[PDB]
Swiss-Prot record, chain A:
Changing N675 to H/K: Resistant to antibiotics salinamide A and B. GO terms for biological process: bacterial-type flagellum assembly; bacterial-type flagellum-dependent cell motility; cell motility; cellular response to cell envelope stress; DNA-templated transcription initiation; intracellular iron ion homeostasis; nitrate assimilation; regulation of DNA-templated transcription elongation. The modification N6-acetyllysine is found at K1020, K1198. It comes from the Bacteria. DNA-dependent RNA polymerase (RNAP) catalyzes the transcription of DNA into RNA using the four ribonucleoside triphosphates as substrates. Resistance to the antibiotics salinamide A, salinamide B, rifampicin, streptolydigin, CBR703, myxopyronin, and lipiarmycin can result from mutations in this protein. One of its GO terms (cellular component) is cytoplasm. It is an enzyme of class 2 (transferase). Acetylated on several lysine residues in the presence of glucose. This is DNA-directed RNA polymerase subunit beta. Its EC number is 2.7.7.6. PANTHER family: DNA-DIRECTED RNA POLYMERASE I SUBUNIT 2. The RNAP catalytic core consists of 2 alpha, 1 beta, 1 beta' and 1 omega subunit. When a sigma factor is associated with the core the holoenzyme is formed, which can initiate transcription. The rRNA transcription and antitermination complex (rrnTAC) consists of RNAP, NusA, NusB, NusE (rpsJ), NusG, SubB, ribosomal protein S4, DNA and precursor rRNA; S4 is more flexible than other subunits. In pull-down experiments interacts with CedA. (Microbial infection) Interacts (via flap domain) with Escherichia phage lambda antitermination protein Q; this interaction renders bacterial RNAP resistant to transcription pausing and allows it to read through termination signals. Keywords: Acetylation, Antibiotic resistance, DNA-directed RNA polymerase, Nucleotidyltransferase, Transcription, Transferase.
Swiss-Prot record, chain B:
The gene is rpoD. Interacts transiently with the RNA polymerase catalytic core formed by RpoA, RpoB, RpoC and RpoZ (2 alpha, 1 beta, 1 beta' and 1 omega subunit) to form the RNA polymerase holoenzyme that can initiate transcription. Identified in a complex containing RpoD, the RNA polymerase subunits RpoA, RpoB and RpoZ, CRP and DNA. Interacts with Rsd; this prevents interaction with the RNA polymerase catalytic core and with promoter DNA, and as a consequence, promotes transcription from promoters that require alternative sigma factors. (Microbial infection) Interacts with Escherichia phage lambda antitermination protein Q. The chain holds residues 461 to 511 of 613 of the full protein. Residues 1-51 are annotated as: Sigma-70 factor domain-3. This is RNA polymerase sigma factor RpoD. It is found in: Cytoplasm. It comes from the Bacteria. Belongs to the sigma-70 factor family. RpoD/SigA subfamily. Transmembrane segments: none annotated. It comes from Escherichia coli (strain K12).
From Swiss-Prot, chain C:
InterPro entries: Znf_C4-type_bac, Znf_C4_TraR, Znf_DskA_TraR, Znf_DskA_TraR_CS. Transmembrane segments: none annotated. A zinc finger (dksA C4-type) spans 34-58. The keyword Protein biosynthesis does not apply. One of its GO terms (molecular function) is zinc ion binding. Keywords: Metal-binding, Plasmid, Zinc, Zinc-finger. The keyword rRNA processing does not apply. This is Protein TraR. It holds the Pfam family zf-dskA_traR.
Length: 1340, 51, 70
């Protein structure tokens, strides 16, 4: 057992052993990006891969070729922290080595010269954080992994609704990774069609002619030959003894001196057994059977040299005679059978307007680009570029694999583009399914859905970046002079960097990190979407893809999906899932060899998994690991049933692997209706981080994995002991084993302190270890927000009791005791960023001066001489954060204003008041001020004080490093000097700086002292440069936008408590909005007097079948019971014996669990610290489907000395009398979600109005009035509310004249309206009148 | 026109792009006028731009 | 809210199953000659299904045929 486990150990129910512990939850995001940006000395996907495709680039056959060498990534311009404050994107410069060779004219190739131009710069490409996010403009963003249809060929249906005949249809689609689509589809008439892209439908055979196939080769390829001999006079026929199946005799069919079948008897198994066994090769026939047969090849008249019959022309009893008398012994015909081999391709040729190669190539060109004339060179080139160019087409390897896979080939890799064979083989396979042999695919199966993520999608955006630079490079290499231009002159930077900046900036897949919660971050980075580029659209599909598919078991979560307009269009990644080598979704299983269950694990992709028979998660195996029962519930080929002991090939890894990180965090999930479970893991992520990181009394076990794997916590790099612990930083003196030989030293973790999140919540780290405590590698060193002691604590649990409380929980509303708001415990800290801009207007420059017209010193108290609010000033609504004034001269005031200025003597100023002031109603403490000034404008007073202070702090920080790192390094020098010259007391008298001189006798210890010297002087110099650059960055001109001189950003720390209106919910989809905040006097209490924190409504529980919230409440009740027991014994100071005796009893409980525990923990100093951490309650773990059972809960209630009912009697705090019936009380972990009321509440009397439409508009955040849409008008129309409606869309909004006439009347105390006409309609009259239309208002 | 061209040679040459007071030196005039120039030089934006 | 979504599901599920259930009727009693083709009906089908009118041969066939046109 570890070090931050020894502190507090969660009692774990659940029997099934963990065989594989949860891997890094951010595996997907971090892995994929690492592959994209990395030197790979071969083709595997990456920047190397993208390059190698387009490169080498060569000029227009001018034999001036530009080839690609290799690429490097410059160091980040700013590091993570730096890049965020200023607002740059976190990127690295991409430097690629290019070689320009020139071939002589005319050349057996070889070069006059080649300049090997060093790494031209082509933009900066963003970099991924340590924790899987990007920074685009100082704002953390996530790139959502996408789910789209796998490249390859897929045969589909479109049954039923088509045409209202039933019949069904069958279509094939060739979907390449890049390049045009190739669609093959049937119709009711059983004609094969093709359409490129989604374009005009065309007769399918046209592509064969484009591949230089004439009519004869199409028949030869798609059809068999029925050879007709003219032997003697009039017609024999080659008979295949099989051809006659699925047909009836056409005539007197006889051969071999015996009539096998006469006219009119269908050729069945009898007739075909006879023919095949009797070897009937040749039969004599009438001249009329070829009346329908189609002649195969071309036959011309040997004498006149004229065409008798063109290939694919049907013969007639007269047509045969014309080619029979010409001496033609062979006539090849088509075998046509509408059950087995249908005359499909034959009919297609009859619909084709083309004939030769250029004939079809034109019809393809004129379809793609109608309106412009076809050409010989145009039509030929277009087709070769569509499916046969390495540049404009690629299936990739995965595309080639599924292609070969779906077609029953052997090669798993091959051509990257389609060949004449590839296209033909597909057309072949499509026909087979229509014949009844073979089945169609479905889009939904996760073996036909592929996962892309950041690493791949950036590659593609880089590839397009080059194709638009490639045109440009080829263009320059055409005319380029001799040895003057070099491969930098041609390659611009903006074109490359724009094509990649485009993606990470605005894309459906690049979004603001959902970061109010370590679960929210981790659940976002593990997310899928079938929307956006290359995926489905909400308006397209279509319920099948939204629905949960059987193949989702252990790959995609069935329960964690959004609840909105795109349900099932998102989904969330399952816990143990991983991405296949080929890019499919696989999941872990256990290899069941014969009847034993092994521990060697295998990853099976969606296609791989179907075949095998997989056992179940909850399956009892004992001793060697035989299946206990002779029959075990298992699932194999898409269904689930009971199976034999030794038929099972694999078994589920965990009881958990089907859900997501969100879903797995719900305790007693098994007991919760699936719908409400969705809402649970949906709202869990909306939990705003609390003031005091609690901890769930009722947990699942995952909370430690989510806290650590999410970056929010500070996890020990190397194991060792703590040298220094500050609320600011933590220094770890590394153990020797883990410590590297040189530079020695200590690991120093600088903590993140109070700072703004994306959702204005506060993200603050705190130290969770004390001075000189042992920590090992991979220990928890500091808690993030909403993490406690290494566990993920998204909220704070409290004492909850289910009962009606005089209606203050009517619907799902919640009733809360004052003790909660007094305890500041659901109090939540928010950080808003407010900025002031000094711009340039036509009239002049804005100044940030503190001289503000018509304001008293009351304002200028919180403002310094320069005009910026002081750090630390607690301000509320209206207080000025940054004084600002805009040039507006000669006001042209009116008489009565003029007379007023003369009576009271105000020097009517030539400057407007534009200062940044605190928004009405919100109130907090100023904790930081930043000033960004144009390069070359003089830093004002306060601005210079700040950039001086940032300097003094930065110098202190860097030197603190050196002081700790020196002493840490010198401390190692001291110990190696002691090994062969130990002068303990003699050594540390003299100045420590004067140590480097002491040497050592012949040994490696002489070479070891040598190592620490190098890295000392490097600390000495790396300090110097780290301090230097830091100093330049502060004074350097902060670069801004056009028109803007300087900007002040003020950061506020508002501390919001909790009030009626806030949305709160438990983890089981039980929402509720706190309704009244009650006095502790009025709360339900028990015979011990202890009030209850929340009073929930029992009605919310039966309807919404979330029964886990009750189990949670009871187990929570028992978990606090163990707490109350230890708290008494710890206050009794009973001594280790009485305490340890009681703790040991708790962690076993009944028998058969998985827990294990002491007495190993050092029976004193370690055992006591634990007891403390438990007195608040004993943390229990209910795994997802391995959870606790009622008996274990009731049993733990016994130990806590609490009733098994889970219910007690309560007393009304007001009347003091008993409550009839026992009520349930207990502890339920509850979240406060960030739909906090004082963010939702808006009101407006009279505000801003839109220019175009004189209509209430939000401008100063005194927001626009409520919108009164169509349906709200029918409301007033259904009442008689004629005036209420007029006023609603006249004076209250649209009537530019009426609104002021009204407001004046309102204050005069006359409630009337003088309405007139809405400007909305006034503009229509003009808008219509400005068309050719004379629209008037008639009459009177 | 001159201003777009100076930024080209100096786009890849200066790793990024020359400072607002660098092209000012390249160009013959008062060189603070670049701001004044660059302001009117922009085309207005389509009011019916989707947000 | 959301509760209704669950409600919706229950009504749908119930209706589909019910239709299926009815397609078996109840206490029937009759003869043994198949109405399609006269083949012998065994008392097993008579006692499993009260009122069976289709031999096992026809109780596939037709089912089979429907599938084919799908
Ligand atoms: Zn029958």
């Amino acid at each position: 057992y570890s070090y931050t486990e020894k502190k507090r150990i969660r009692k774990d129910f659940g029997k099934r052993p963990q065989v594989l512990d949860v891997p890094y939850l951010l595996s997907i995001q971090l892995d994929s990006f690492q592959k994209f940006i990395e030197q790979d000395p071969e083709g595997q996907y990456g920047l190397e891969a993208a390059f190698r495709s387009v490169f080498p680039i060569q000029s227009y056959s001018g034999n001036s070729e530009l080839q690609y060498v290799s690429y490097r990534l410059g160091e980040p311009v700013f590091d993570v922290q730096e890049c965020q404050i200023r607002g740059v994107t976190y990127s690295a410069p991409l430097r690629v080595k290019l070689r320009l060779v020139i071939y002589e004219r005319e050349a057996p190739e070889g070069t006059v010269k080649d300049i090997k131009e060093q790494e031209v710069y082509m933009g900066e490409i963003p970099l991924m954080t340590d924790n899987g996010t990007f920074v685009i403009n100082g704002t953390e963003r996530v790139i959502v992994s996408q789910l789209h249809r796998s490249p390859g060929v897929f045969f589909d249906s479109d049954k039923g609704k088509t045409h209202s005949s039933g019949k069904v249809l069958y279509n094939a689609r060739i979907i390449p990774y890049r390049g045009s689509w190739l669609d093959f589809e049937f119709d009711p008439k059983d004609n094969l069609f093709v359409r490129i892209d989604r374009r005009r439908k065309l007769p399918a055979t046209i592509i064969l002619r484009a591949l230089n196939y004439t009519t004869e080769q199409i028949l030869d390829l798609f059809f068999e030959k029925v050879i007709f001999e003219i032997r003697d006079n009039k017609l024999q026929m080659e008979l295949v003894p099989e051809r006659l199946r699925g047909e009836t005799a056409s005539f007197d069919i006889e051969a071999n001196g015996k009539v096998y079948v006469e006219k009119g008897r269908r050729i069945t198994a009898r007739h075909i057994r006879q023919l095949e066994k009797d070897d009937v090769k040749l039969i004599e026939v009438p001249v009329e059977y070829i009346a329908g047969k189609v002649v195969a090849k071309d036959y011309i008249d040997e004498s006149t040299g004229e065409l008798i019959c063109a290939a694919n022309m049907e013969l007639s009893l007269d047509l045969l005679a014309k080619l029979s008398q010409s001496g033609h012994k062979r006539i090849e015909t088509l075998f046509t059978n509408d059950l087995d081999h249908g005359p499909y391709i034959s009919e297609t040729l009859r619909v084709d307007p083309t004939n030769d190669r250029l004939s079809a190539l034109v019809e393809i060109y004129r379809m793609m680009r109608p309106g412009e004339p076809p050409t010989r060179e145009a039509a030929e080139s277009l087709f070769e570029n569509l499916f046969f160019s390495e540049d404009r087409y690629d299936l990739s390897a995965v595309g080639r694999m599924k292609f070969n896979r779906s077609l029953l080939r052997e090669e798993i890799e091959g051509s990257g583009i389609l060949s004449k064979d590839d296209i033909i083989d597909v057309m072949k396979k499509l026909i087979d399914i229509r014949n009844g042999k073979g089945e169609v695919d479905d889009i939904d199966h996760l073996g036909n859905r592929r996962i892309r993520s950041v690493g791949e999608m950036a590659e593609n955006q880089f590839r397009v970046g080059l194709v638009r630079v490639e045109r440009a490079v080829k263009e320059r290499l055409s005319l380029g002079d001799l040895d003057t231009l070099m491969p930098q002159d041609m390659i611009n930077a903006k074109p490359i960097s724009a094509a990649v900046k485009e993606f990470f900036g605005s894309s459906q897949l690049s979004q603001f990190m959902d970061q109010n919660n370590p679960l929210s971050e981790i659940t976002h980075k593990r997310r899928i979407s079938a929307l956006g580029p290359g995926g489905l659209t909400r308006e397209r599909a279509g319920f099948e893809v939204r629905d949960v598919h059987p193949t989702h078991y252990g790959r995609v979560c069935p329960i964690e999906t959004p609840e909105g307009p795109n349900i099932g269009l998102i989904n969330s990644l399952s816990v143990y899932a991983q991405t296949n080598e080929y890019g499919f979704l696989e999941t872990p299983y256990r290899k069941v060899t014969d009847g034993v269950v092994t521990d060697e694990i295998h990853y099976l992709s969606a296609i791989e998994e179907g075949n095998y028979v997989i056992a179940q998660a909850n399956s009892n195996l004992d001793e060697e690991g035989h299946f206990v029962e002779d029959l075990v519930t298992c699932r194999s080929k898409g269904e689930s049933s009971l199976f034999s002991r030794d038929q099972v090939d694999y078994m589920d890894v965990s009881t958990q692997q089907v859900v997501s990180v969100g879903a797995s965090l719900i305790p007693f999930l098994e007991h919760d209706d699936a719908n409400r479970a969705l809402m649970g893991a949906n709202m869990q992520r909306q939990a705003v981080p609390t003031l005091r990181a609690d901890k769930p009394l009722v947990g699942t076990g995952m909370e430690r994995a989510v806290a650590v794997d999410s970056g929010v916590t500070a996890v020990a790099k190397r194991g060792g002991v703590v040298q220094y612990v500050d609320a600011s930083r933590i220094v770890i003196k590394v153990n020797e084993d883990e410590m590297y030989p040189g530079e020695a030293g200590i690991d120093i973790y600088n903590l993140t302190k109070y700072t703004r999140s994306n959702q204005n919540t506060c993200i603050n780290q705190m130290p969770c270890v004390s001075l000189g405590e042992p920590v090992e590698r991979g220990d928890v060193l500091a808690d993030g927000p909403s993490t406690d002691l290494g566990e993920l604590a998204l909220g704070q649990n409290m004492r909850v009791a289910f009962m009606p409380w005089n209606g203050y929980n009517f619907e799902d509303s919640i009733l809360v005791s004052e003790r909660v708001v007094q305890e500041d415990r659901f109090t939540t800290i928010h950080i808003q960023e407010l900025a002031c801009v000094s711009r340039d207007t036509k009239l002049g420059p804005e100044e940030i001066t503190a001289d503000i017209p018509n304001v008293g010193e009351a304002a200028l108290s919180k403002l310094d001489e320069s005009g910026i609010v002081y750090i630390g000033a607690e301000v509320t609504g209206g207080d000025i954060l940054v004084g600002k004034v805009t040039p507006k001269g000669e006001t042209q005031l009116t008489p009565e204003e003029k007379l007023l200025r003369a009576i009271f003597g105000e020097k009517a100023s030539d400057v407007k008041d534009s200062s940044l002031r605190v928004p009405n109603g919100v109130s907090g403490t100023v904790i930081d001020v930043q000033v960004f000034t144009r390069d070359g404008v003089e830093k004002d007073k306060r601005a210079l004080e700040i950039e001086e202070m940032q300097l003094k702090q930065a110098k202190k920080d860097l030197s603190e490093e050196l002081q700790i790192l020196e002493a840490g390094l010198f401390s190692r020098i001291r110990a190696v000097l002691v090994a062969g010259g130990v002068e303990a007391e003699k050594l540390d008298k003299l100045p420590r700086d004067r140590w480097l001189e002491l040497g050592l006798t012949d040994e490696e210890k002489q070479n070891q002292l040598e190592q620490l010297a190098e890295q000392y002087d490097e600390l000495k110099h790396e300090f110097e440069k780290k301090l230097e650059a830091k100093r330049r960055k502060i004074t350097q001109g902060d670069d801004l936008a056009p028109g803007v001189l300087k900007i002040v950003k003020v950061y506020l720390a508002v501390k919001r408590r909790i009030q009626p209106g806030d949305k709160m919910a438990g983890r089981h989809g039980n929402k509720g909005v706190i309704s009244k905040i009650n006095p502790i006097e009025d709360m339900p209490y028990d015979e011990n007097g202890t009030p209850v924190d929340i009073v929930l409504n029992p009605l919310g529980v039966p309807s919404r079948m979330n029964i886990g919230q009750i189990l949670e409440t009871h187990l929570g009740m028992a978990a606090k019971g163990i707490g109350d027991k230890i708290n008494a014994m710890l206050k009794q100071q009973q001594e280790v014996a009485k305490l340890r005796e009681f703790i040991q009893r708790a962690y076993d409980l009944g028998a058969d669990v998985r827990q294990k525990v002491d007495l190993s923990t050092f029976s004193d100093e370690e055992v006591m610290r634990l007891a403390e951490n438990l007195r608040k309650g004993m943390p229990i773990a209910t795994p997802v489907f391995d959870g606790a059972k009622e008996a274990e809960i009731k049993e733990l209630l016994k130990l806590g000395d609490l009733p098994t009912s889970g219910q007690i009697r309560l007393y009304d705090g007001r009347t003091g009398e008993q409550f009839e019936r026992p009520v349930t009380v207990g502890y339920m972990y509850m979240l406060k979600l960030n739909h906090l009321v004082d963010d939702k509440m808006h009101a407006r009397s009279t505000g801003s109005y839109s220019l175009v439409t004189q209509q209430p508009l939000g401008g100063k955040a005194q927001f626009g009035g409520q919108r009164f849409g169509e349906m709200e008008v029918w409301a007033l129309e259904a009442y008689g509310a004629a005036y209420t409606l007029q006023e609603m869309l006249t004076v209250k909004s649209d009537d530019v004249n009426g609104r002021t006439k009204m407001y004046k009347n309102i204050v005069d105390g006359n409630h009337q309206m003088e309405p007139g006409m809405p400007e909305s309609f006034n503009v229509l009259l003009k808008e219509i009148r400005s068309l050719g239309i004379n629209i008037e208002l008639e009459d009177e | 026109n001159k201003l777009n061209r100076i930024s080209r040679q100096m786009l890849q040459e200066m790793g990024r792009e020359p400072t607002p007071e660098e092209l000012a030196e390249r160009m013959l005039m008062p060189e603070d006028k670049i701001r004044k120039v660059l302001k009117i030089a922009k085309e207005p934006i389509s009011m019916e731009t989707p947000i | 809210e959301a509760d209704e979504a669950y409600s919706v599901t229950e009504q749908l599920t119930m209706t589909g199953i019910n239709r299926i259930r009815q397609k078996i009727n109840a206490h029937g009693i009759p003869v043994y000659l198949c109405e399609a083709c006269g083949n012998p009906i065994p008392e097993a089908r008579r006692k499993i299904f009260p009122g069976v009118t289709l031999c096992v041969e026809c109780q596939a066939y037709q089912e089979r045929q429907r599938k084919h046109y799908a």
